[PDB]
Amino acid sequence: ADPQAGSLDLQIDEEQPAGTLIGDISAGLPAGTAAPLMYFISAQEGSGVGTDLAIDEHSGVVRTARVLDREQRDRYRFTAVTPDGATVEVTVRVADINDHAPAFPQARAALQVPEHTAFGTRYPLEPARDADAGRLGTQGYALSGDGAGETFRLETRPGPDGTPVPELVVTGELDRENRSHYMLQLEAYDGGSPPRRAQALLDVTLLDINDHAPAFNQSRYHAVVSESLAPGSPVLQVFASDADAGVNGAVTYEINRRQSEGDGPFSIDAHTGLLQLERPLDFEQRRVHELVVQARDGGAHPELGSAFVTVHVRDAN
Amino acid sequence: EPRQVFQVLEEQPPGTLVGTIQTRPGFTYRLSESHALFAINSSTGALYTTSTIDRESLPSDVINLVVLSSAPTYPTEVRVLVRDLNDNAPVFPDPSIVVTFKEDSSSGRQVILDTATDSDIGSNGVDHRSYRIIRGNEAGRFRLDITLNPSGEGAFLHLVSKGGLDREVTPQYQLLVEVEDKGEPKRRGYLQVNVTVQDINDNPPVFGSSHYQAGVPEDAVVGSSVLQVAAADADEGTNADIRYRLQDEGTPFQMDPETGLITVREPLDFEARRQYSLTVQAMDRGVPSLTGRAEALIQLLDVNDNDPVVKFRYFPATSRYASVDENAQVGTVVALLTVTDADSPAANGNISVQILGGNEQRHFEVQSSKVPNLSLIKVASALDRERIPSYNLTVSVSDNYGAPPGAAVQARSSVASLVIFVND
Ligand SMILES: *[C@@H]1O[C@H](CO[C@@H]2O[C@@H](C)[C@@H](O)[C@@H](O)[C@@H]2O)[C@@H](O[C@@H]2O[C@H](CO)[C@@H](O[C@@H]3O[C@H](CO)[C@@H](O)[C@H](O[C@H]4O[C@H](CO)[C@@H](O)[C@H](O)[C@@H]4O)[C@@H]3O)[C@H](O)[C@H]2NC(C)=O)[C@H](O[C@@H]2O[C@@H](C)[C@@H](O)[C@@H](O)[C@@H]2O)[C@H]1NC(C)=O
Ligand SMILES: *[C@@H]1O[C@H](CO[C@@H]2O[C@@H](C)[C@@H](O)[C@@H](O)[C@@H]2O)[C@@H](O[C@@H]2O[C@H](CO)[C@@H](O)[C@H](O)[C@H]2NC(C)=O)[C@H](O)[C@H]1NC(C)=O
Ligand SMILES: *[C@@H]1O[C@H](CO)[C@@H](O[C@@H]2O[C@H](CO)[C@@H](O)[C@H](O)[C@H]2NC(C)=O)[C@H](O)[C@H]1NC(C)=O
Ligand SMILES: *[C@@H]1O[C@H](CO)[C@@H](O[C@@H]2O[C@H](CO)[C@@H](O)[C@H](O)[C@H]2NC(C)=O)[C@H](O)[C@H]1NC(C)=O
Ligand SMILES: *[C@@H]1O[C@H](CO)[C@@H](O)[C@H](O)[C@H]1NC(C)=O
Ligand SMILES: C[As](C)(=O)[O-]
Ligand SMILES: C[As](C)(=O)[O-]
Ligand SMILES: C[As](C)(=O)[O-]
Ligand SMILES: [Ca+2]
Ligand SMILES: [Ca+2]
Ligand SMILES: [Ca+2]
Ligand SMILES: [Ca+2]
Ligand SMILES: [Ca+2]
Ligand SMILES: [Ca+2]
Ligand SMILES: [Ca+2]
Ligand SMILES: [Ca+2]
Ligand SMILES: [Ca+2]
Ligand SMILES: [Ca+2]
Ligand SMILES: [Ca+2]
Ligand SMILES: [Ca+2]
Ligand SMILES: [Ca+2]
Ligand SMILES: [Ca+2]
Ligand SMILES: [Ca+2]
Ligand SMILES: [Ca+2]
Ligand SMILES: [Ca+2]
Ligand SMILES: [Ca+2]
Ligand SMILES: [Ca+2]
């Protein structure tokens, strides 16, 4: 209501040519003012007014001195002053255009998830960047592919600025000994009049946990040998297997030396499972040897299997 | 030629009657050798023990003697059978043993135990079918499995899990195992089995709060502490050893991975960024590693760390001097005085511009406008270049103007000069 101090709100789209019209300072004066001879312009240091705006201090017309980027600077403010001391406070808001599509950091992302991971475990995914503001930035996500919906679901919760960030949530059982690789597709989109969109492929691979123990293929094995059998010679081979991968499934063999009976003359090959004779037998001191052989895998805390081995020793003559 | 067979129980008083040989009229009888265990009555042929015999102590429980006659000698071969009492109990190699199951082992996983032995004869020996869990299995998590070796030599015992072991509920069991022998008075042996439940990494770290919050002045020095986070992990050993980290690694803060303390690593600047809402992760050192997450909101506090600056704006802007014609009426704007101070109104207080000499003739005036931080420099009195051709006005600006003594915020200030030539 004070003629001495007015204000003016101007608007301009980003990314327009240098020289584009913004407005006219005189529009902010009281109606019916004699056109001033000149305008003084006050802007604070750092405002970008001198570099981005071209103000005709005689006519009061405001243009762009350069192509303006909302993503870099979105607002300019200055005061215009007449030679007799009246002021017009003007603000220019730079209008956002959708010059940015959503963008993932990789077209192919790879996520390792341990088999049998607990229901509800969350893996935050890389967002799709979009520099634009509000609805012009990234608005949502959609996940497709095998397991999408039943074994994995996608969920978004807003981080800072309300930028939705996506997380992949384990919702079914994962078993590396059934299916160890999932090929997922993640889509993103902003909110333009036709949204601009991004796609990324997500390769999920199951890490092996040590959820199987070695199992022998017989519960008891039997060998029959002569008491004359020469040391260093084989007696019997046992076989255990383990369904895991890598160290978790790498089986080694030993003889249990506490609970076996007739233990001393024998040893077993830690990797082939071949039991061999180390010292001579004697029918008259022991006719039958009852051993237990054990298989362990290479896991962090190895899992164990065992089997019985009965060696029958026959008298020489 | 002749051979007789006697028996005698072990553990009997010295002087026990073993037997009497079948004598012939007119003979006496002696042992062919002195025997440590026995002695003969030479007139009756009765055989007696000379000590208490321990059958478990003998090389053989069958003893062979030769009785010799007087007169014209004939020999009598004797076989003494030392008969066994059930005077030894079944014993285990160790009174107590330790065995281990992994938590979340499947039902039917087993681990081997020890069996007993018994120093009496086999009919007074261990009944390997009789092993039994008699104490400590209240929760019903275990059962025994006995395997009798088909060859008749020995047995194997196993402890079997029926599944459902959880270390975080019960980390330890103590079972009592009883075995029997087969003898006249039945004797018993016992094995204490300590069951350890081994830990797996089935619990993730959990932050004590799901939202942290800290306030930090923007001038906090590097290394200064900002906020301490802490998580707990219900597992054991390595499976519950926690390393902390920030999700966003491009902030001026730093998370010590072992203590969960966030410190300052790079200088902060309220004017550049006022607040950081960061996600903190906690990760255990188990294989399958597990992770917990929380939020941390660190708000910076504005400090008065920027001087206010004064800039003059006047019409040969490419020049360092203003000009005003001598003809300019009172009230003519000669220059704008604009103040810029990057701090916020909190840390700034009142900002005031004051004229520091140059205007002794009161030919100009400095007038605050209705817009904050802009003053006008106007012509205040008639001019003429002949009396004064030029002026040099010096103004000082100051934030926190008029603050009482002992106030928490120190005021900052600068000076600026504006020189004005008069044209004609
Ligand atoms: C207009 O007035 C301005 C304000 O000066 C004050 O007011 C006047 C009326 C009088 O009372 C002065 O005594 C007051 O200071 C003038 O600007 C000031 O100029 C002085 C002199 O140069 C500045 O001072 C120096 O500043 C330098 C840059 O910051 C420093 O390097 C220097 O310190 C070291 O260096 C010199 C030489 O190596 C040594 O002599 C020093 O002892 C020291 O070792 C000085 O501190 C002061 O900063 C200015 N103040 C402001 C607010 O700008 C102005 O003077 C004009 O500008 C200066 C820079 C010179 O070029 C002058 O010759 C020149 O006239 C007045 N303008 C006029 C008169 O036209
Ligand atoms: C089997 O366990 C017993 C008892 O262990 C106690 O209880 C556990 C839950 C745990 O807290 C242990 O620290 C306890 O000691 C062991 O018996 C102890 O043995 C030590 C040394 O042999 C002896 O100093 C203590 O007096 C014993 N305690 C009792 C109550 O008798 C036993 O040794 C374990 N067996 C094996 C093979 O380790
Ligand atoms: C356990 O595995 C071994 C090794 O594969 C088997 O031994 C083989 O037995 C078959 C007949 O069953 C023979 O034809 C082969 O010559 C044997 N040797 C090898 C190296 O294969 C053994 O039979 C298996 N036990 C059971 C119960 O299947
Ligand atoms: C061997 O046994 C006989 C018979 O017991 C002992 O002779 C005597 O036996 C009568 C009864 O038959 C007893 O009343 C006497 O006391 C026995 N005599 C003695 C000296 O004890 C005979 O003594 C025994 N021989 C030995 C060496 O003890
Ligand atoms: C393996 O998984 C498929 C689903 O992907 C399921 O239909 C099948 O029964 C599983 N196989 C076994 C042996 O459980
Ligand atoms: C439109 As939005 C991602 O700032 O809530
Ligand atoms: C101990 As060897 C050389 O007989 O295997
Ligand atoms: C030889 As088994 C099946 O009792 O471990
Ligand atoms: Ca732009
Ligand atoms: Ca966009
Ligand atoms: Ca834009
Ligand atoms: Ca599996
Ligand atoms: Ca596995
Ligand atoms: Ca395994
Ligand atoms: Ca022989
Ligand atoms: Ca005895
Ligand atoms: Ca006995
Ligand atoms: Ca016995
Ligand atoms: Ca043991
Ligand atoms: Ca558990
Ligand atoms: Ca655990
Ligand atoms: Ca853990
Ligand atoms: Ca613990
Ligand atoms: Ca600052
Ligand atoms: Ca500040
Ligand atoms: Ca300040
Ligand atoms: Ca005004």
Residue numbers in the entry:
A (entry chain A): 40 to 356
B (entry chain B): 44 to 467
Please give me the paper's original passages concerning this structure.
The atypical cadherins Fat and Dachsous are key regulators of cell growth and animal development. Fat4 and Dchs1 are two of the largest members of the cadherin superfamily and contain 34 and 27 extracellular cadherin (EC) domains, respectively.
The Fat4(EC4):Dchs1(EC1) interface contains a hydrophobic cluster centered on Leu379 of Fat4(EC4) and Val120 of Dchs1(EC1). The EC2:EC3 interfaces are largely hydrophilic and are formed between the β6 and β7 strands of the respective EC3 domains. The alignment of EC2–EC3 of each protein revealed that the EC1 of Dchs1 is tilted by ~35° towards Fat4, making it the only protomer that adopts such a pronounced curvature in a protocadherin-like binding interface. This distinctive conformation was observed in both the high- and low-resolution structures.
